[PDB]
Structures are given as structure tokens and as C-alpha cells.
Amino acid sequence: MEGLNLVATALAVGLGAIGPGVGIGIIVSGAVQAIGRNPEIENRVVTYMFIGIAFTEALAIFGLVIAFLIGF
Amino acid sequence: MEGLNLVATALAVGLGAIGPGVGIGIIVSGAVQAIGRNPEIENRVVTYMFIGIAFTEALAIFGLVIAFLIGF
Amino acid sequence: MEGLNLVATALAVGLGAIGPGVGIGIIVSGAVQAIGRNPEIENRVVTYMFIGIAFTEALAIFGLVIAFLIGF
Amino acid sequence: MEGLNLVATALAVGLGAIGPGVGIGIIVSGAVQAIGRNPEIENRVVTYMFIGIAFTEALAIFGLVIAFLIGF
Amino acid sequence: MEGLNLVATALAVGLGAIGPGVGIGIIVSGAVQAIGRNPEIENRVVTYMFIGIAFTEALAIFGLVIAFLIGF
Amino acid sequence: MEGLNLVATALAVGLGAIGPGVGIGIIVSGAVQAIGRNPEIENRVVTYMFIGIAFTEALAIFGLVIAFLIGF
Amino acid sequence: MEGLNLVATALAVGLGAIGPGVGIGIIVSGAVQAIGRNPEIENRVVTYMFIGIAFTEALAIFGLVIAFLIGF
Amino acid sequence: MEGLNLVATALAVGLGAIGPGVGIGIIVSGAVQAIGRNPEIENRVVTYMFIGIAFTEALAIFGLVIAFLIGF
Amino acid sequence: MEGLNLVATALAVGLGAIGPGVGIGIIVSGAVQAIGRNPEIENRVVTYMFIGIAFTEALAIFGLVIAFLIGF
Amino acid sequence: MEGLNLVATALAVGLGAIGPGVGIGIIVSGAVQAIGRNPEIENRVVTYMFIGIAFTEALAIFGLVIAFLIGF
Amino acid sequence: EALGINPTLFIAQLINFLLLIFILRALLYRPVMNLLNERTRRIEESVRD
Amino acid sequence: NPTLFIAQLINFLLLIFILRALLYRPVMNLLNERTRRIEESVRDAEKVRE
Amino acid sequence: GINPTLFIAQLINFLLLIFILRALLYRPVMNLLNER
Amino acid sequence: PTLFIAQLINFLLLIFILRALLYRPVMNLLNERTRRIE
Amino acid sequence: PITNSFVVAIIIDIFVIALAVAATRNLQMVPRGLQNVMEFILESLYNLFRNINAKYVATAFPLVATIFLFVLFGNWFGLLPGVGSIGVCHHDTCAAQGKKLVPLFRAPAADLNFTFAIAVISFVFIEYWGFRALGPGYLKKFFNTNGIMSFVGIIEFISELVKPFALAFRLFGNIFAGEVLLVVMAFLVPLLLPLPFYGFEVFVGFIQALIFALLTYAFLNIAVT
Amino acid sequence: VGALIISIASRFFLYTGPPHVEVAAEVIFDGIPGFPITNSFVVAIIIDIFVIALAVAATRNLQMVPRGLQNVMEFILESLYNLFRNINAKYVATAFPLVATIFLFVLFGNWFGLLPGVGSIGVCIHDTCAAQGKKLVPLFRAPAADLNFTFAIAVISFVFIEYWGFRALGPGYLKKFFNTNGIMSFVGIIEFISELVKPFALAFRLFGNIFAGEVLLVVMAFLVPLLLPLPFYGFEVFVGFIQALIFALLTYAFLNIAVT
């Protein structure tokens, strides 16, 4: 049953991207809503927004690299 | 297996688009709600909405290119 | 197997509509709620709504083309 | 073998109707909330609610069509 | 494979109902909350809730018939 | 095979219960919140609660029926 | 396959505990928030919270009895 | 195949933890929100949390039973 | 089947975390929002936040332990 | 099934990175909104956020190590 | 176990950590805490007069 | 391993330079502010004593 | 497959039902309109 | 069939039990509408 | 040829005709009895259809009234005692000379033939009256009207095509699912078990009967608007 | 600056130079009869002596006005003191020598794991030892990547919380051991299970969050070794700092929730 590495890479990529996508979507939505509510406290908001985005995209990169390992 | 590559391509395209299918939606909903609550903060919410959309489409495009590597 | 390409087409279509399906709903709900809270901001918001709807639609279409390749 | 076509039709019908379902639900909920906030805006929110419903139902109908083609 | 039609029809009738259930729930919750906000608009809200539910429920129905087309 | 009927029945029941559980939860939460905000319309919203719950509940029953058609 | 009965028995419980698990949570959260917003409406929301919990638990019990039937 | 009991136990535990985890999250979030908005009701309302949370755990515990029965 | 126990461990870990992951996030987000709304009530709301976190973590560690036992 | 360990190490990381991603997203959104509404408490509640984030990532980390314990 | 768990190594790590705890309590924690309390008590004495 | 040591050492040096060019100034400012605050506090205490 | 003859018979029965209901309810609708 | 007969008996019992409560409010509403008509 | 659904459709027709003739036999002010019930039902439906659109509430009312009065009674006929048990024969009573014990009383909406008739008549209704007062703009696809407005204008057309299909499928599916659930719960325990399902079935039948007319009128309203 | 991003320096021996993965869970360095010294224990000593030397340097000639090492030590210690007092204001003095040293040990352990030579330097693609007939066991492995160190920290914390939960509120503990009536009886067994899970969760959290990071750094050194793993070096610095602080925070929070 050769070719299972292909479905392994696909599964890793898809199942590691379905979570972080929603995570960073929620992060950006919350940050943009807080900014719209009042614009004065902006930098101290974008800081944590980008921290969370970096964490969640780091999870996505975890998935991507472990998929690339199955690839090469 | 004579067909597992096609299933892998389908998984890599389909999965990995659920996350960047809800993330973009939540981002745009938050952006337009912040626009409606405050019409004069348009630029400072639109730039961040586009930043988040690009961040999520990064995962989407990564999944697509991995599918292309699987398919071709 | 021999019918695995049919399953590939189904997965490409089926999984490609889970994300955009929720995303379009969330975008339209957010834009409509913003219009209800402030009718005068409708026009601009509508454009961004149609910007949001198209993006996720592409990631649905990105699945569809796979069914237009695997299928035939 | 001998039944993967049935599994493909089932998967297409199923997975192609769990994103659009939630999308239609959220669209109608948001539209009804906007109605409750402002009644006069009805004519300007029923249109966009129906546009979003049309988009998500188009995704679901495309899934159903792809399933039915697999059948015949 | 032997007995794949049974898992096929079960998968169709099951996956077709994990999305529309949430859609109907969200629609009913939104309509009830909007009626709570403004009781006098219910005659214009229910007429949009019900046609929403059908627009959702039909999707789940697209499972059942397909299941009945797979089962029978 | 010798036991694909069992996994079919289990899959049908579980997937038919995945969605309606969340749907009923959302319906009851929204109705209870509306009652708490305005207790004078209890029988007005409870009427729309149960006739929503059944709409959701029927979906799960759908799956159950298929389950009782498979294991039988 | 020989343990297909075991995987079916596990799958029934596992997939039937997904929906009601979130439904009971949503119901309890909504009832709790309504209680906090208005302690005077205690019984008239506790009854409906228990009714919704009974519905979701009934779905879970259907799942459990199907798993027991497969187990037996 | 051979180790089907192991994947059965795995599915039981994982899918029995999928739902109740979110249920506990939503219950505790609602109770916390109620406490923050109205501390005086705490001695009552937290009880309504507990008599809820255990119910949700009663689902996951069920899975744990299938974890040990199949496991042993 | 020449390595099915690896799939069992993966499913036990993987499926047992997608539920608690959302639950812990919902719990702590609700706690943070309640803290922001009412800064005074902090030392007591965290007591319930942490018991909820402990229950959710116990649910996830159930799956982790089950995976380790299969690994052993 | 000579390459089933690849599917196992894919599922171990893919599954188990969906829940924590949404959890981190919800955490960052809630904390950002809370500090936007109540800036004077931003320096206090962030410590509660950075705890919960890692909590969720803990589960995701439990996905990775097992993957590394499956791949290697 | 194959995951590198050995009772003697775990006991040795525990002993090392406890020795670190006591040494840091007697070398850094007590002097620095004494200085911080000295600063606070000096502030209180100053605000007394 | 004379091929990953060079990769780490170059990467670690770049990370150190990045942190020194991005985080050294704020932490130095914070430490200097703490020192100034505590020295002004003890100076005020001595002046009140005087 | 579906028997077209049965569907045509059902449609004819529905049309006859509509005609009979309209003929009978023309008096009831008029009575309701005149009374209120 | 004995099973069919028992099912019909249970259905009739449930129908009567539900219909009593349903018709009580239904009869009250019908009487109120008739009284308010004239 | 005919099936066992047609005989129940005919008996529902007879019931409807008898009820209407009884109501119209004595027409007078201050109704009381069956005529009062029918008048109240008709006026409530009239108000319900007025809420969506008051322009056509007095035009398509008899069609939707017949649709409701037929589907409701057809659904209610499935829960009556004797349905699914009386056998025509082309353990069971008909075990000797077995003919599968064909049920004489089969609910009208429990087939794919009758339910498709209302769907196609509603389709021709929306197509006809939609084109009545709109000209070519009724089914206008708006080709690049507001930026490739044709794409959205095309995907909406297939939704209109499947809307009658969805309606007929949902009616048949819910009726058949209710019938099979009743039979299964009867087989499980012959008494006192399907009590939560007996009342659920009639409620679902009535709800779907109402929602069919509601959805058809909503489609008619959105067709002209 | 401008747009001179060329990334040609990134195209330097993408995967031919560094080894493929070369990761493991735990290994033994020995060197003495009896106790099998590991490479993690070597770092657990080289960090312990480093922390002691830092403490001596900071407290060397304690001046009234802070300066340099004394100043940063005071800042860290008082920030931790305030952070713990935010949760509980009564047991900070008692629990501080353990919790603060957990933070100060785990932080330097995680940060030592990113020092160059953690995987490159070792003893008996092909590295060096593999050229000879003996395998290459790596020295200088981060102590938090050891399952004998994280479990030691977890069991020490568990003993501490149990001791201070039994020394306070009385030896009843009826909230989790056993209850007579109500749903509290059902809640108690779940609470006991969660409490037993708690040290396992802490140890697994720390061990995984450090070991996965080290493995990530090695594997992303394997592919495109230059200038690509810089953001992840930064991310792992931040994750090490987090996993250091949150371990202390969770220890003290669990202590407070046990006392209450």
C-alpha cells in the first residue's frame, strides 16, 4: 500500500491548518473590535494580537514542518 | 494503491481550507462591525483586517502548494 | 482501489465547503448586523462584505477545480 | 472496491452540507437580530441575507450535484 | 468491499445533520432573542425565522433522501 | 464485512447526535436568556422554543431511524 | 477484521458524547447568565434548563443504548 | 485487523473528550460571567454550575468506561 | 495491522485535545472578560476558573494516559 | 500498511492542534477586548492570559511529542 | 522504560533540586527579601515623620 | 558535528544581535528608571530625616 | 423509478380538492368578511 | 398482529392523554373567540 | 394502476370535502362549532400570509389553503390506529400465502409521487406569477450588472430549481421518518414506549404542513420582490 | 536597507550538510560507577552552579542603591513577589523559596537549550563520531527535556501543595476525598482525579514544551540551516521564558486553590 506518505502529508497539513486559521481569525477579529471600540489603546493591543498570532502560526508551522518531514 | 495520490490532493485542498474558511469570515465580520460602530477608524481597522486575511491565506496557500506537490 | 478517485472528488468538494460555508455566513451576519446598528454605514460595509465573501469563495473554488480535474 | 462510489456520494452530500448549514443559520440569526434592532432597515437587510443564503446554498447544491454525478 | 453500502448510507444521514442542527439552533436562538428585544416585530421575525429553518433543514434533508437512495 | 453493520449503526447514531445536541443547547440558552431579560413573554418564546427544538430533534431522530434500519 | 464490534461500540459512545456535551454546556451557561441578570426568575429558567438538558441527555442515552446493543 | 481494540479505546477516549471539554469550558465561562456581573447570587448560581458540569462529565466518564472495558 | 497501535496512540492524543483546547480557552477568556468588567472580584472568580481548567485538563490527560498505555 | 506510521505521526500532530489553536485565538481575543474596555487592568489580567495560552498549547504540545515519538 | 525513566536518576535530580532550593534560600532569597523589607520599613519610618 | 554547530553559532549570533538591537534599550531604560526611582526615594527619606 | 400515472392521479386529486375547497369556502370567506 | 394491536392501543392512549390537555385550552380559546365575535 | 397512498389521499379528500360542506351548510354570523374552528383557522392563515405580502394574500390563498388542509390530514392519517397494520396481501397475519403484508393505509406524503405534484405546481406557480408582473427581469441573471453580477445571478437560478425539489424531499423525508420511527418503537416495546414519539409525530406533521404553505408563499413573495 | 532581501544566504546547503534529524528522548553519559550520569544532569549542574554564582555576584556587597546584577536580581525577585501576592497574600513567604527557584532553574535550563552546541557537541550528515565506529551521543541537553527532571519538579511541587493543604483548612479535605450528600459527592472523585493528574500534567507540559522546541530547532537546522530558524529561535526563547514563569505561577495557584 505505497503512497500513504502522500495522504500522511496531506492529513498533517490540513489538520494542522484547520485550527490555527480559526485561531488567528478570532484573534484579528477581537483585536480589530477592541481597536474600533476606542483607538487610544492601540499599540498595547496590537502587541498581544501579534503575540497570539505568532503563537498560533507557530502551531501551524509545527504541523507544516512535521508534514514536510514525511515529504523529505 | 492506484489512487491514493488523488485522495491526498483532495485532503490537502479541502482540509486546510476549513480553518482559512472560518478565520477569514470572523476577521471580516469583526472588521465590518468595528466599521459600523466607528466609521472614522476605517483605515486602521481595514489594514489590520487585510493583515489577518493575508496571515490566514498564508496557511491556505501553503496547503494548496503542498497539494500541488502531491498532485504534480 | 479502483473507485478511489470518486472518493477524492467527494472529499475535495465536501471538505472545501465546510470552511467557506461558515465564513460567508459569519461575514453576511456581521455586515447585516452592522447595517442594522447604523444604516448610513451600509454602503462601505457592503463592499468589504463582498471583499470578504469573494476571498473565502476562492478557497471554495480552489476545491472545486480539483473536482474539475479528478472528476474529469 | 465495490461500494466506494456509494461512500463518495455519501461523503459529498454530508461534508458539503455542514458548512452551508451553519452559514445559513448565522446569516438568518444576524438578519433577524438586525430586524429586531431596526425594522425599517428590513428591505436593506433581507436582500443581503438572501445573497449570503444564495452563496452558501450554492456551495451545498454544488456538493449535491457532485454527489449525484458520482451516482449518475 | 462487502457491506460498504450500510456505512455509506449511515455516513450520509449522519454527516448531513451535524451542520443543519447547529443552523436551526442558531436561527431559533436569534429569533427568540430578537422577539425578546422587540415583541411587536415578531410577526416580521417569525416569517423570516421559519423560511430560514427550511433553507437550513433542506440541506439535512438532502442527506436523508440520499441515504434512502443508498439504503434503498 | 462481518461487522460493518455495527460501525454503520454507531456512526449513524453518533453523527446524528453531534449536531442536534449543539442545536438544542443554543436554542434553550437563547430562550432562557430572552426569558430572563423579559419575563412577560415566557409563553410567547417557549412556544417558539419547543417548536424549534423538535425541528432540531427530528434531525437526530432521522439518524436514529437509519440506525434502527441498519442494526436490524 | 475481528474487533469491528469493539470499534463500533467505542465509536457510538464517543460520537454521541460530542453533541450533548456542548449542548448541556451552552444550556447551563445561558441559564446561569440569565439567573445572574435576574435572580427573581430562578425557577422559571431552571425548569427550562433542565428540560433542555433532558433533551440532550436523551440523545446521549440513545447513543449509549446503541453502544450497549453493539457491545451485547 | 489485529489491534482494532487499541484504536477502539483511542476513539472512545478522544471522542468522549471532544464534546465535554467544550461543555466544561462554556459552563465555567458562563458561571464566571455571572459572578462578575452579580457576586451576590454566587452561592446559588455556582451550584447550578456544579449540578450542570457533572452532568456533562457523565458523558465523558461513559467513554472512560468504554476505555477500560475494551482496554482490559 | 503492521503498526495500527501507532494510529491508536495518535488518535488517543489527537482527538483528546481538540475538545479541551477550546474549553480551556473559553474558560480563561470568560474569566478575563469578567475581570475586566469588574476588577474588584478577582480572588474568588479565579478559584472557579482553575477548577474548570483542572477538570478540562483531566479530560485531556485521560486521553494522554490512554495513548501512553497503548504505547507501553 | 507499510507506511501507516506516517499516517499516525500526521494524525498525532494534526489532530490535537485544532482545539488549542481555537483556544489560543479565543484567549487572545478575550484578553484584548478586556484590556480595551478596562485599560487600567491590562498589566494585571495579561498574566492570566499567558497562563491559559500555554495551557492550550500544552495539549497541542502533547500532540507533537507523540508524533515525534511515533515518527521516531 | 524506553523513555529514559530511572528511579536512581530521578532521585538524584530531586536531591540536586532540593540542595539548590536550600542554597538559594540561604544565599539570595533571605538577603534580597531582607533588603526589600528594609526598604519598605525605611519608607514607613520616613512617612512616620 | 562540524556542520550544525556552524548553523547554530551563526543563527545564535544573529538572534543575539537582533535582541541587543531591539530589546537592550527598553530593558536598560526600565532598569535605569527603577534605579532613579529607588535612589530618589532613599534621598527623600534621608532629607526628611535631615 | 416513480410511477408517472400515480403522480398524475395525485395531482388531479389535489386539483379537484382545491376546486371543491374554493367552491365551499367562497361562502365562508364572504360570510367572515361581511361579519367582520 | 399482537404487536400491531398493542402499538395501536398505546397510540390511542397517548393520543387521548395529549388530546385532553390540548382540547382544554383549545375549547377555552374557541369559546372565547365565539363570545368575542358577537 | 394505483398504490395504497392514493386511497388515503382519496379518503383525505372525502374528509376535507365533508368538513367544508358541513361548514358551508349553515353560514351565519357568530360561528360556533366546526364552522367556528374552520373560520378561525382560515383567518389565522390569512393573517399569517398577510404578514409576508398583503398584495397577493387574497390571490394565492385557496391554493395554500388546500395544500395545508391536505398535507396536515395526510400526515395525521399516519398516526391513526390501523395504519401500517391493515394488509391487502396484493409473525404477521399474512404469513400464510405471504405477500409482505402491504399496508392498506399509507400516508399520502409518504411517497415520491404525490409529494412531487405540489412541488411542480408550486414551481409553475412561481414561474408563472413571477413572470406575470416582471417581464424578463423576473428570472434576470444580471450579467455583469454590478461587476460580473452574472455569477451570483447564475448560482441563484439552480437554487430556484431545487427549491421545489427540496420542499418535496423534506415533506416525504419527515413523513417517512416519522412512520418508520413509529414502527420501530412499536417493535421495540409494544406499549408506553413510543408515547414521547406519538405526540412528536403529529406535531412534526402539522408543523411541516404549515411550513410548506409558508415556504411557498415566501418564495412567491421573493419572486416578485 | 531598501528592498535588499535576497535570501541567497538562505540557499546555503539546504539539506546536504546538516544531519537528517538525529533526535532522542534521554541518553546516559555515565563517567562514574554506580550512578549513570546523563547529559541533562550535566546541564542541571552547570545551571545550578551558574545560578549559585549569579546569586553570589548579585548579593556581593549589598548596597542601598541597586546597580547592575543586584538591580536586575532585585527587579526579578520583586516582580515574582508581586505576581505571587496577586494570587495569595499569605503563603508567599513560605512558598517563595520553592516557586521562585523553580522559575529561576527552569528559565536558565530552557535558555541553555538554545546555546550553540546542544546537539552538535557530543561523545562516542555523518557529523564526526559516525565516521568512527561509535555512535554520537549529544552532550549539553537541556534539563527540562529530561523526563527525570520535570517529573522531579512535579513531584516536589505535589508534595509541597499536599503538605500545605493538609497543614491548613484541617485534615478533612471533604471537598474531594468523600462527601455525604448532594452532587458534591460526584464532584469530589473528579476533583481527586484532577489533583492526581496535576503533577503528571505539569511534568508532561514542561518536558514536551522544551523537548519539542529543541527537536524543532535541530530539524529546522537540518533543512535551510542559515537564517531561516531565526524567528523560531526567538519563539523558543519566548516559550522557554513562558514555560519557566507559568510553572511557578501554576505551582502557586494550585497551592492557593488547595489552601482555600
UniProtKB/Swiss-Prot annotation, chains A, B, C, D, E, F, G, H, I, J:
Keyword Cell cycle in record: no
Entry's Gene Ontology BP terms: proton motive force-driven ATP synthesis
Regions that span the bilayer: 7-27, 50-70
Pfam family, one: ATP-synt_C
Matches recorded under SUPFAM superfamilies: F1F0 ATP synthase subunit C
PANTHER family reported for this sequence: ATP SYNTHASE LIPID-BINDING PROTEIN, MITOCHONDRIAL, ATPASE PROTEIN 9
Assembly behavior: F-type ATPases have 2 components, F(1) - the catalytic core - and F(0) - the membrane proton channel. F(1) has five subunits: alpha(3), beta(3), gamma(1), delta(1), epsilon(1). F(0) has four main subunits: a(1), b(1), b'(1) and c(10-14). The alpha and beta chains form an alternating ring which encloses part of the gamma chain. F(1) is attached to F(0) by a central stalk formed by the gamma and epsilon chains, while a peripheral stalk is formed by the delta, b and b' chains.
Function field: F(1)F(0) ATP synthase produces ATP from ADP in the presence of a proton or sodium gradient. F-type ATPases consist of two structural domains, F(1) containing the extramembraneous catalytic core and F(0) containing the membrane proton channel, linked together by a central stalk and a peripheral stalk. During catalysis, ATP synthesis in the catalytic domain of F(1) is coupled via a rotary mechanism of the central stalk subunits to proton translocation.
Annotated protein name in UniProt: ATP synthase subunit c
Protein species of origin: Chloroflexus aurantiacus (strain ATCC 29366 / DSM 635 / J-10-fl)
Lineage start: Bacteria, Bacillati, Chloroflexota, Chloroflexia, Chloroflexales
From Swiss-Prot, chain K:
Coiled-coil positions: none
Compartments it resides in: Cell membrane
Residue stretches spanning the membrane: 3-23
Subunit and interaction comment: F-type ATPases have 2 components, F(1) - the catalytic core - and F(0) - the membrane proton channel. F(1) has five subunits: alpha(3), beta(3), gamma(1), delta(1), epsilon(1). F(0) has four main subunits: a(1), b(2) and c(10-14). The alpha and beta chains form an alternating ring which encloses part of the gamma chain. F(1) is attached to F(0) by a central stalk formed by the gamma and epsilon chains, while a peripheral stalk is formed by the delta and b chains.
Described purpose of this protein according to its UniProt entry: F(1)F(0) ATP synthase produces ATP from ADP in the presence of a proton or sodium gradient. F-type ATPases consist of two structural domains, F(1) containing the extramembraneous catalytic core and F(0) containing the membrane proton channel, linked together by a central stalk and a peripheral stalk. During catalysis, ATP synthesis in the catalytic domain of F(1) is coupled via a rotary mechanism of the central stalk subunits to proton translocation.
UniProt record similarity statement: Belongs to the ATPase B chain family.
Full protein name: ATP synthase subunit b
Interval of the full protein contained in this chain: 2 to 50 of 164
